[PDB]
Amino acid sequence: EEKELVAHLRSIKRYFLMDQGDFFVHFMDLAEEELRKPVEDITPPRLEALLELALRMSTANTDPFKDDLKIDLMPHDLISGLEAFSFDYIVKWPLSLIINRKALTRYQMLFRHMFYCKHVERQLCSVWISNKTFAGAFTLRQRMLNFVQNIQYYMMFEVMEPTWHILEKNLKSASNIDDVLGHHTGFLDTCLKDCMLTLLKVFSKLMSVCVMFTNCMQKFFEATINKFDKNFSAHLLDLLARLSIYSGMASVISRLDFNGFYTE
């Protein structure tokens, strides 16, 4: 009731899990040119001025706790400039027992993994208009767009959402703080497990050919489009081979292919 917690966890979810859409489509649109620059070249006084302006102009203006978002450029990538950006959240004392630096970097580990997948299909969909006024790349763009927009749907409505839906109800029947401290870390270790965050590094290298293919099309050859095909399609088949060999982690295949394609 006082210094409420359930009305405090929702605010973190809007930015960390990127629930709020109006805030990111307007932030990356403003702070893109200033993120492609390399690391140790961008002034944080320039980013934070855009973050503050991104919140107020968006529909996140109705948020009492919005003033606790800080920019934190990580030194290491998800083992520069763009791959070294992640929000940071500062909280007061009494709530710091629940959401602390030990269990906030986890919110910051599954954020960059979603800011990467949101960035690629943001520009992959941007080349969609440039070509529309040499003609065999449209059927390859279909192979990557129907992959990221089939991972994002599984990553947002059938992974974190279900776990979050449980946590909200699982905090109405709490009895003591060392239980809430269990229903929380019991929610972060599940999101990091159902997602590919726990190894499965083939996804990391799989994303390289997607973003790089956007660069080739942005340079406007015919022997290079077909070169990406044999390279990306081979990397995708390595994924479904390892995603299938297990004891959901199996329903993901039904999301990747729906027409019986990739039956090889």
């Binding site: 109006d22 990111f24 059927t139 129907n146 927009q149 409505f157 839906h165 292919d257 394609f261």
Partner: protein, 369 residues
């Protein structure tokens, strides 16, 4: 990113005037353009509140309506007069463009059946000249009539980056079957239900689909196959809604397979049985897709306006839309054998034949090359 809409002809005005009325009520906005006290993103269509519309004798009917404080029959007559006011109507669109922060699209509402046909053919040509990076979606409505209809299709197949078909014939059936009307003042109520529920994901921000180019690039795989049809069941679980959208009784259309499906569920249904229904739809095989490329079905949830129960809308890219063209193509040749160059009609005739062939080639396991 803002979307400035256009309304041409008696049709475009009437559907747009009733589209805004559906939106003005879905938000807490009085018809006096004043917010009522009574979270929903409203900046895309409204400018801080005024709608971003550029209309073009029905106008007087709007100026007498309580919403006054919110703002021949030849295809050649439409294209000719549109050239005489080239600078007039482009003054308005340009002054409305730069005043906006960052323009995104041009949702254009016009019927291809008098002056809206010839004028809309003129605009879709002129927009691609000056604005080369702006999407142009059109909510065209299907009904000398064969001539004016197909001539717009020449422009709508190479200029408009999207198109949503809504034929009055299939609508009239649903007007007769489940509404028992026998009127324009009634079928437009269904059209306004389709137009408003189409952009429900832009006005209510969710996980994805926070921009118009997100709804477009997912369905339309190639620049040519850019025609979409709609499906709206409520006239109860997610399985109840998903099964009804795929029935041919609900589609607003009078081998064959789908290309991409997007489901809009505006209910408060818990997001846990969303994957179970998709799993079931695959098993019973209620719909088939293209064999060549990987085609998947996507479902999206949203939140109903509290100021105004489960609904559902489906954006479909179906090859069976090629049938509507053939009806236009057929009646043209009959009028071509019944009666300064008359070459534009024949040149338009050729490109429509290229399109229909592309559809019937899309259902082949070797559509590539």
């Amino acid at each position: 990113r803002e979307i400035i809409t256009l309304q041409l002809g008696q049709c475009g005005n009437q559907i747009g005037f009733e589209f805004w009325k559906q939106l003005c009520a879905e938000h807490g906005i009085s018809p006096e353009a004043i917010v009522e006290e009574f979270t929903d993103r409203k900046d895309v269509f409204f400018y801080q509140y005024i709608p971003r519309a550029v209309l073009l004798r029905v106008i007087h009917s709007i100026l007498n309506s309580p919403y006054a404080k919110l703002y021949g029959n030849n295809w050649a007559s439409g294209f000719s007069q549109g050239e005489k006011i080239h600078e007039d109507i482009f003054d308005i669109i340009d002054r409305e463009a730069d005043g906006s922060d960052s323009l995104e699209g041009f949702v254009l509402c016009h019927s291809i059946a008098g002056t809206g046909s010839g004028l809309g053919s003129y605009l879709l040509e002129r927009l691609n000249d000056r604005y080369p990076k702006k999407l142009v979606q059109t909510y065209s409505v299907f009904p000398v009539q064969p001539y004016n209809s197909l001539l717009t299709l020449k422009r709508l197949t190479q200029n408009a980056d999207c198109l949503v078909v809504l034929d009055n014939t299939a609508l009239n059936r649903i007007a007769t079957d489940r509404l028992h009307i026998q009127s324009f003042s009634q079928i437009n109520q269904l059209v306004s239900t389709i137009m408003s529920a189409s952009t429900t994901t832009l006005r209510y921000p969710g996980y994805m689909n926070n921009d118009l180019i997100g709804l477009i690039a997912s369905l339309i795989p190639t620049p040519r196959l850019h025609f979409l049809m709609t499906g709206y069941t409520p006239l109860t679980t997610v399985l109840d809604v998903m099964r009804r959208l795929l029935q041919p009784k609900n589609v607003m259309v009078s081998n064959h397979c789908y290309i991409a499906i997007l489901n809009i569920i505006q209910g408060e249904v818990d997001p846990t049985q969303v994957h179970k229904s998709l799993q079931r739809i695959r098993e019973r095989k209620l719909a088939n897709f293209i064999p060549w490329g990987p085609a998947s079905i996507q479902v999206a949830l949203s939140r109903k306006s509290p100021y105004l129960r489960v609904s559902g809308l489906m954006m479909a890219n179906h090859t069976s839309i090629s049938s509507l063209f053939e009806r236009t193509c057929r009646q043209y040749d009959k009028l071509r054998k019944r009666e300064d160059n008359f070459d534009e009609m024949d040149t338009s005739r050729e490109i429509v034949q290229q399109l229909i062939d592309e559809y019937h080639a899309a259902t082949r396991p070797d559509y590539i090359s």
